[PDB]
Structures are given as structure tokens and as C-alpha cells.
DNA sequence: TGCGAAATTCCATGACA
DNA sequence: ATTGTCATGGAATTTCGCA
DNA sequence: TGCGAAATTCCATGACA
DNA sequence: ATTGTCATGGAATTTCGCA
């Protein structure tokens, strides 16, 4: 009352231009604005109006000031209307993010076979057998696949297919996502008793699996085109399907993940014959080169309105599986470090360090 | 004539009969020729079927040009006649009663049999569990003829488990007398 | 073998270059091309050789090419392969599009209230005095929404509700989406009775009714904030929010459904008080203007590889529910009218007219 | 004087006791005072509960500045009032046994009266599934004062529902005997 | 040293729950 | 403590066969 | 006739099962 | 016989207050 009472007789006041005529009327100060005239309410019921009218249906900015401009009018209304935004909870966990995320990554590929493997489920499938999941483990380097029939996504049903697999090679490093069959104690043990280190994808984003998902998808399509108009019979078709992925070219590398593997076609049909005079030796040493001289994709353009994080920056990570008229954010988090431009230690809402992926992250609007 | 190369030759036999192990009784042996590289494969009789049933595991990663074997009944079956046909696989015989192969097949076969006897005393019945790590260790064994193991002739790469240790092989003073129990 | 006779002694066929020397070997026709020496197979077994080599894994061009070039030369070999792709049923059903759609249209907003109603079902909800779904009612043209809990998506109940709406008035046209309750005999008699022509979406393709869906929209998220902290009773909320909604401001319109509808705030919340000394009719004049004055936005670009149906055209239609291991798309149709850029009829796998959206279908390849 | 606008003035009144149709006995009438638009809601009871529950639907449509109403006791209750005030919604009474309004308002309560008792003879029990009928033809009649009907003045267009048929409203001779009787 | 056609490369599209 | 991927078929570009 | 700041407009992003 | 839509908040652009 203070502030506004010099303003009536006359006096200027910082932020309230000194061409309009501020009068009083029915104990209220207003304002001849161009728009009509407004009330100026004191300083100290402005957090109230603005509470009032965001509330209505819980608006943004613009649509929250309109309603507050219809009566009132004072120095930087959307000054303090955001200011109400970034302290609404409501608001911060309920709503979508606009802004999307930096370009992906595209790491580089192991530099050889059995330098990393991606392990995943597939399923459930229909019941074949008594089968109904497929484990699918992908070498890294050469796309080499091989396919392990299951009757659940089990702990026990991993370590006895990869006791099998590796029964030809130990890899260094095993990569899946943060599935139960992976995360488990005894798939913890079953690794370090064998020098494998266990490398986990960041929770609920398949795309860090994408080598061994992209797989996936081969091998659904390949045993849809073979079950046409048969019942989906699909246990005697693994091995099938195994041996003609792994002897499939890729148009883009030329070679197929059996190349790249031995370097040389077995006793399959078409096998490339071009380095039958060669002997092993010199077949091995046109392997080496090869495998060191394949396509790599780059990084692809940022889009036009992307964030990245910062060490410090509010940031809110999504809710997993939400239920039904639940917010798909959680309060916000703090980030701790920056691993690459995709990934992120947060301060977890529930007070843990957890490693998470950009995409399944939004900043906090309104600092 | 064309240099050797993996997959132009697998040679077979059966190992048996072993102390059940999960219900098994065999093991068979598929050697490359050119590498040397082993694959084994616990059986429960040396019959066309197993045989079968084992090979299509095997040959759903690699399919060889000619498969070798002795004249053991499972193998000159009809039935594997048929099973070699559909996949373009040629079978050949050694004659009866005169085992051939390669030097570094004999020697391989060697390796495999005594590296089994040496594991078999003081747990003849665990030794299902043990097939792969009894891969690993042959497969990974320095070859004194190629200068190379198996393991980097079929992949042209160093691996992630090098035996270094290289085992004695022989029986101690210990495993002979216990074994000779049985 | 006529044919492969003249090249062995020398003669020129159209096709087979002159600067490569033919030869016989092992009886067969062979010739010296730089990746190598390959095999010239007679004519009439070129289309075995293909399709051996495609039914490996169901390969397309390249991969498929690549396996036959291991062995064999002949005049256009890409030629034979792609009239194999086009042949094989099992890789025509199973694999996806790899051309987009053209650019989506804006349709006209409806120009007066109750021109064009759409309306939808928002539901299953957890369980709130016993009702379970909420039939939304958005009037095209104003946006003003009207929301009526049930305890079905059914056609009774969607008969009950628009009897009480359309108390106030009858619109020309309901929009709807394929669902059960709109697609009745029952709702069509009930609607015919009243003049209502009833219009609905092509299947499987809710942007068609993308008004009332954004709308749905708005309505969960108000109905989330609400609720946050309390227990999901979400009965006795229907009303505020319908309120809510209905007074809020569009940033992009500068106005209210509300204020579209009646021209007038009512006695809400920071009602606008602009036209207090106009006459009614002034205000419903002024009201005209802004109702043909409103922003409408335009078809975006299209994308660099969109493909537009036309007729005749060979395409097909998205499985609606896909079984697990069954193919994505229904066998080739013929498009028999183009209705618009977006929308065309074909004479569907069944034998009957069916008008779908070109976001369910695909042009099938090789044509 | 500001001119005169839709929401300005809600009047209500009840009408009943009818004969029971569904359950119900009673209509809530609400009449907007400057386009005569009408709303009418079926009750059980003259009761606040009745009239709170049945306004509660009005006002999340629109909410008016006034309501006025006579002296009846649901209107002129303790949890009315704390309703209308919760609302932003100022109560207006009329004096004891002086009901006024306005004439284009009791004329339109004239309409209503008289409407209902037209469509009640011969069916007295089916009247629930009319009102939705009766409000159409209501807020579709044509104004002589104001040469507008109350769909065009509440929403400025006109209505896909136009009344060109304007009834009689009077009962005819057979209606005037059968509803004598009753 | 240049033309028409074939061969090869490019790359947006979409699906891996 | 971690990170998208790659078959596909029209289109765009390069290469081939010949002069 | 031009400057700094506020006000307004622009528009990519994402979700309606 | 049919057809995407629009709240959101940083950024880009325009307008305002003053000289
Ligand atoms: C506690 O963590 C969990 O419960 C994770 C469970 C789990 C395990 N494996 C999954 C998923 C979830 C899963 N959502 C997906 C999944 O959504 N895949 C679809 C998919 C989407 C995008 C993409 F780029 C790749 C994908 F495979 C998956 O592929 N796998 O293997
Ligand atoms: C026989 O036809 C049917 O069974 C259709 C069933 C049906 C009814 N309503 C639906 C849907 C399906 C449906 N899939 C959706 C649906 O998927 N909505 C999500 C959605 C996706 C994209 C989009 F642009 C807008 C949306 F709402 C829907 O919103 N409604 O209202
Ligand atoms: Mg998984
Ligand atoms: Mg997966
Ligand atoms: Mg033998
Ligand atoms: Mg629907
Ligand atoms: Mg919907
Ligand atoms: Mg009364
Ligand atoms: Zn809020
Ligand atoms: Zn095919």
C-alpha cells in the first residue's frame, strides 16, 4: 500500500510507466491501459491472484496470464507467473517435456569377436514344445548369433545356455538389459567365477541393447515368413533360423556374421569361394584387415530444440510403468555427473546414485 | 592342389561307455581337420539318433564339406547316409579295422582321451559339468607343428582364456592307485 | 543351352559383353569376370537358382543378389531377383514400408457450434463409485467439451448421455471412431430419428478423431494433478474439470472455449469483462467475427521419401491385431478410389469396399 | 446502466407434484432472464439436496451471477445459501406471496406450465424421456419482443432444430375431456 | 571423351515388448 | 557405473561397354 | 530514430490405448 | 463412404517506454 500510494498523487515508481493515469475507485487502484482498465493489486496479494488463477486448470504461462490480465494489471505479470510454475509439484510431475534429447551416440564396435556380447529374451512366444522364450546372444563385432529355446526368462535358463555357448569361447564383457535373469546374485557369481565382466544397459531403454534387439527383429520376421499358413510350430525352426541369419549378407558391411567370424563359408549354399588359393594364414591376414576396415556410422544432427545435461541442472527422470491417472515424472533430481552426452548420474528421488539414460529424462522448466 | 582350410574335413568317433553323468553315457568327438579345433557332445548310446540329434546342434553353426568316422554302426547307418545327403555332406570311411586320419587328429584323439581319464578319477560322475571346460583347454592348447591353437586358427584372434598352465597330463602316483580301484 | 552354344564359339548375343572370354569346364559354361570366374547358367534354370537363394532367409535385393553372385554371372542378374521378391508371398505379407506417408490435411474447422460433435471413450479407469469409463463429447468448432461417467463403453449408455446433452441442442454431424458403441444399429436408428448424420473414422487410425483425443488428453492430465496425493477418486472431479476446461484459454486462439460458445464469460474466475457495454447483439456480432477469424494451420511438408496412393494401385492393408509370429500386412489390394491425399478405398483381402486411412497401408514393392 | 446479458440472472422455480414418471416427481425449472433459454431438471423432491445436486450440473456448464427464486424452503435454506455463496452466486428473493420476475420470464414459466400439461394428458407416467423434447422446443420459440429465439440470443447462430410449426398450446376438445377425468 | 544402360551406393523408413 | 541398430527398396550416383 | 527491456509470437515436442 | 490436434516453455521477433 506503501509503494501504490505515492503512485496515485503522482510520483514515479520504477516499472510503472509515467504516461498512464493511475487513479483510485471503490478502494482499488487502477490503470487506464490500452486494453481497458485494470486493478493493481498491492505487492503482497499477487502471489495469491496468481495461485488463484493457475489453479483454475492448472495452465502454463500464456494461459495463465490471460486469465489474470482479464482483471489485473501490474510490473512483469509473467515474471511472477512463471515463479508460481516452477513451485507447482503438480505441474512439474505431471507435465510433458518440449524439449528433446541430444543425437544418439554410436559407439564403437568391439574390435573383436568375443570382445562383448548383448544377451536378451525374446517372448513370451506361443507355446512350442513346452518352450515359450528364446535367448538370443549377439557377438558384438560380427553380428554372430546363436538362439537358446527356454521356458521362462530365467536365471537358472541363462547359465545353462551360456555354459553351452561358452563351451567354444569366454567373452570379455557380456552386455544385457536390467531384466531379473540378468540382475540376479547368481548371474553376478556365475560371471566372475569366469573373468566375464557384466555390463548393464540404463533401465527401461532397449536402445543401449540395440545390437542383440535389432537381431530380435530378424529373427521374428524370418520365423513369420516360414510359419505362413502352418501353426506356429517354432521350436524345430531355431537352428534353422540361427544358421541362415549368421550366413545372411549385410548390404551395407558386404560380408555376412559368418565372415567375419572365420573368414570363410563352410559347406552352406553359395559359399563365397574367392580365397580358395589363399592358404589359412593368408586368409587370417585379409580377415584382420577387414574387420578393422568396416562402416561406421556417425553421430546424426542434433534437432532443432535439444538439451543436454549439466553437472548441477535440475532434471526429472520418468516413471516407469505409472499407473492409471498418475504422473509420469518423479520430483525432481539433481545431476551428479555427466559419463557422456547421453548418460547421467542422478540423485535419485529416493535418495540413491542411479546411472540413467537422457531419454527417459526431462529438465526441470522454470530453473 | 587348394590349401587346407577349416570346415573341409570333421572326424568323429564316440568315446564310451563313460560313469553315468546326468544320465549320460558318451561323448562325441568331432575334430576339425585343419585346425584341430574340438567340439564335444554327451551322448546317451552310440546310435544313429544321438548322433543326429548332436550333429544338427553342430551344424546349425557349421556345416563341413566331408565328414570322416571309423565303420562304427552309427555311422554307416542309412539313416546318417540320408541325414549327410540333405545337408551336402560327404561321408567317408576308414577301413575296417584300420583307423586313419591326420597326425594331428591321432594326436588330438590322444589328447582327448588321456585329458578325460585325468578328470574322470576322484569324480567319475561330474564330468557332464566339465565338457566345457574340457573344450576350453584343448581348444586353447599350443600346437607344437602350426605354431597356433585352435582356437586362433578358426577365429584369427588371441583369446580370452590362453592355458598358459600347461598341464602334465599324466597320472600323479595318487590318481594312479585310486583309479585302478575301479 | 542354344543360346550358351553361340557364346562358347564365339559368337555375340545382346547382353553377354564381347571383351570376356566364354569357356567350358567340368561341363559348364563359365566365364572370366575381374571378382573372379563364375558360372553362366542356361535360362531355364535361372529361377530356380533365385529363388534358392532367396528362400535362404527371405532376403531382398542386395543380400539375395550378393549369395547368387558367389557362384554364378548372367545378364541382369537384380532383374530376376526383383521379379522373385515380387512373387513371394510369405516377404510381401511380412516385411515392413520403408516409404512414409504423404502430409497429414487440416481439415476446415466446422464454422458454427453444433455443426460437428466428436466424440470418444476414455477408459478403463480405476473403479469410482462404481463407474469405470467416461464418454467425451468435444463440439469441433468452439472445443467445448462435455464429459458423462459410465460403467460401460456401451451403446446404452451412450444413448443415456446424449439424450441429456443434446437437451440444449442437436448437432448436424457426430463424429466417431470405429468403436462397438457407435457402430451399433441401435446408435444409427437413434441417430437417424434426430436428423444426426453419424460420420466415423477410418479404422484403426485414431488421429481422424484427433479433436476429441487431444481433448481426452487435457482431461487425464487435469484429472492427474488433481489427484496427486489422494486416492483415485476421480467420480466427483468430472464436473470441475469439464469447468475447468472449458474456461481455459488456448495461447494460439486467444480465447476460451467457453468464450466461443456464448461470446460472454460467466460468473467464473477472472471472467473477462471486455464487452460489458455492448448491446447482446453487439456482442454476438462481434462474436461472429471471431469465430471465422480463428488461426487454422496448414499441411506440413512432405517428407523426402512419402509415397500418395494412386487408383489401381497395388497396396496393403495393416493387420489390425497381428497374432504373435503372423505377418503385419494382409495380402496385395487394389486402390478403387482416392478420396483424398490421406484417404482411399480398396478392394479388400475379403472381397468387400473398405475405406481405410494411407497410414494403414503400404505400396506393395516390385509392384 | 450496463445492458442486460446471459448469466446475469438465473430464475428457478419447481413444478410438481407430477404424476411419477421413472422415480421422479418434480422439474427444476432455470430460466436465464436475458435470452430466456430453459433448462429443466427432474427431481424426486423439493428438497436443497435435490436442488444442489440438480444445479450442480447447470453450473459446470455456467455459473450465474444471481439466482432469484420465491421464498420456498429449499430455496431459502441455510445449505443453499452456503452452496450459492461457495459458488460466487448472490440470492435473490422475491417477497412472500408476491412472486415477480420479469414479463418475459413469466411468460416463458406461462409456456411451460402449459406445455407440459399438454404432452402429460395421455401419458401422464412417460414425461421424462419429453424434457429433452420440451427444452428444445422451448429455447426454439420464437420471441416477439425481442425477434429472436433463445438458441440464436445464448449462442448468436441458428439452431439445426428450427420449430417452424408453432403448436397450439391450447387443449383440444378430446384432451380437455380425458384430462377431466383423471 | 561421351553416351545409354547397368551396377552400385545412398539413405529415409520402421521395429526390435 | 554407461553409449541404438540394420534390412529394405526406390532414388541418386558411379561404373561399365562400346566407340 | 534508436536503444534496452518487456511483451508477444513462434514453433518443435509429445501424448491422446 | 473420408481428413490430426493443441498445451507447453524456451527462443525468436515485435512492441513498448523513453529520449
Ligand atoms: C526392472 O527392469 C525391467 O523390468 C526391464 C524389463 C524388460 C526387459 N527386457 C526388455 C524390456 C523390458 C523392454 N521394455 C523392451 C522393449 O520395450 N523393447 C522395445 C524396443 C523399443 C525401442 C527400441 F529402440 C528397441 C526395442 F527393443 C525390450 O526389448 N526388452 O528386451
Ligand atoms: C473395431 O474397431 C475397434 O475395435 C476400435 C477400438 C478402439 C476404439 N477407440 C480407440 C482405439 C481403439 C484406439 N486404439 C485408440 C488409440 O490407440 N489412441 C491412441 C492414439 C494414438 C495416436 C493418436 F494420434 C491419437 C490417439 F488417441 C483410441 O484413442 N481410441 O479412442
Ligand atoms: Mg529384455
Ligand atoms: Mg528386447
Ligand atoms: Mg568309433
Ligand atoms: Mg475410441
Ligand atoms: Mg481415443
Ligand atoms: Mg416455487
Ligand atoms: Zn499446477
Ligand atoms: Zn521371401
Not at chain 1, 503522482?10 to 490500452?34: A, M, N
Not at chain 1, 510431475?93 to 544418439?104: D, E
Not at chain 1, 546372444?137 to 541363462?158: E, N, Q, R
Amino acid at each position: 500500500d506503501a509503494e501504490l500510494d505515492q503512485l496515485l498523487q503522482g510520483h514515479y515508481i520504477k516499472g510503472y510507466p509515467k504516461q498512464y493515469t493511475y487513479f483510485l475507485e471503490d478502494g482499488k487502484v487502477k490503470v487506464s491501459r490500452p486494453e481497458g482498465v485494470k486493478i493493481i493489486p498491492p505487492q503482497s496479494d499477487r502471489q495469491k491472484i496468481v495461485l488463484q488463477a493457475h489453479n483454475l486448470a492448472h495452465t502454463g504461462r500464456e494461459a495463465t496470464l490471460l486469465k489474470i490480465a482479464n482483471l489485473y494489471w501490474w510490473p512483469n505479470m509473467r515474471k511472477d507467473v512463471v515463479k508460481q510454475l516452477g513451485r507447482c509439484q503438480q505441474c512439474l510431475i505431471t507435465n510433458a517435456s518440449n524439449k528433446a534429447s541430444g543425437p544418439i551416440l554410436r559407439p564403437d564396435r568391439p574390435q573383436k569377436p568375443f570382445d562383448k556380447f548383448f544377451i536378451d529374451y525374446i517372448g513370451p512366444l506361443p507355446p512350442s514344445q513346452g518352450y515359450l522364450y528364446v535367448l538370443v546372444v549377439v557377438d558384438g563385432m560380427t553380428g554372430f548369433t546363436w538362439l537358446y529355446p527356454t521356458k521362462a526368462p530365467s536365471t537358472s535358463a541363462t547359465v545353462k545356455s551360456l555354459n553351452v555357448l561358452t563351451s567354444i569361447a569366454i567373452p570379455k564383457v557380456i552386455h544385457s538389459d536390467q531384466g531379473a535373469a540378468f540382475t540376479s546374485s547368481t548371474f553376478a557369481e556365475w560371471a566372475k567365477e569366469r573373468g566375464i565382466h557384466l555390463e548393464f544397459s540404463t533401465p527401461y531403454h532397449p536402445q543401449s541393447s540395440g545390437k542383440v534387439e535389432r537381431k530380435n527383429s530378424d529373427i521374428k520376421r524370418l520365423l513369420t515368413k516360414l510359419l505362413v499358413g502352418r501353426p506356429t510350430k517354432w521350436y524345430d525352426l531355431l537352428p534353422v533360423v540361427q544358421l541362415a541369419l549368421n550366413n545372411t549378407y549385410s548390404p551395407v558391411l558386404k560380408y555376412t556374421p559368418h565372415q567375419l567370424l572365420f573368414g570363410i563359408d563352410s559347406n552352406t549354399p553359395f559359399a563365397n569361394q574367392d580365397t580358395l588359393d589363399l592358404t589359412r594364414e593368408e586368409e587370417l591376414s585379409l580377415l584382420q584387415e577387414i574387420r578393422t576396415s568396416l562402416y561406421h556410422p556417425s553421430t546424426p544432427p542434433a534437432s532443432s530444440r535439444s538439451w543436454s545435461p549439466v553437472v548441477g541442472q535440475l532434471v526429472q527422470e520418468r516413471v516407469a510403468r505409472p499407473a492409471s491417472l498418475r504422473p509420469r515424472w518423479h520430483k525432481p533430481s539433481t545431476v551428479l555427473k555427466v559419463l557422456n552426452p547421453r548418460t547421467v548420474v542422478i540423485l535419485d528421488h529416493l535418495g540413491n546414485n542411479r546411472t540413467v539414460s537422457i531419454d527417459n529424462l526431462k529438465p526441470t522448466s522454470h530453473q | 592342389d587348394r590349401p587346407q582350410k577349416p570346415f573341409d574335413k570333421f572326424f568323429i568317433d564316440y568315446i564310451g561307455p563313460l560313469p553315468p553323468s546326468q544320465g549320460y553315457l558318451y561323448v562325441l568327438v568331432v575334430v576339425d581337420g585343419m585346425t584341430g579345433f574340438t567340439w564335444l557332445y554327451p551322448t546317451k548310446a552310440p546310435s544313429t539318433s544321438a548322433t543326429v540329434k548332436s550333429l544338427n546342434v553342430l551344424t546349425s553353426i557349421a556345416i563341413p564339406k566331408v565328414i570322416h568316422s571309423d565303420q562304427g554302426a552309427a555311422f554307416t547307418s542309412s539313416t546318417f547316409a540320408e541325414w549327410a545327403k540333405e545337408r551336402g555332406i560327404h561321408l567317408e570311411f576308414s577301413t575296417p579295422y584300420h583307423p586313419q586320419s591326420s597326425g594331428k587328429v591321432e594326436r588330438k584323439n590322444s589328447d582327448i582321451k588321456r585329458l578325460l581319464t585325468k578328470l574322470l578319477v576322484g569324480r567319475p560322475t561330474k564330468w557332464y559339468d566339465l565338457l566345457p571346460v574340457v573344450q576350453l583347454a584343448l581348444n586353447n592348447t599350443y600346437s607344437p607343428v602350426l605354431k597356433y591353437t585352435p582356437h586362433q586358427l578358426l577365429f584369427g584372434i588371441d583369446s580370452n582364456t590362453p592355458f598358459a598352465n600347461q598341464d602334465t597330463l599324466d597320472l600323479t602316483r595318487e590318481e594312479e592307485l585310486s583309479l585302478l580301484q575301479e
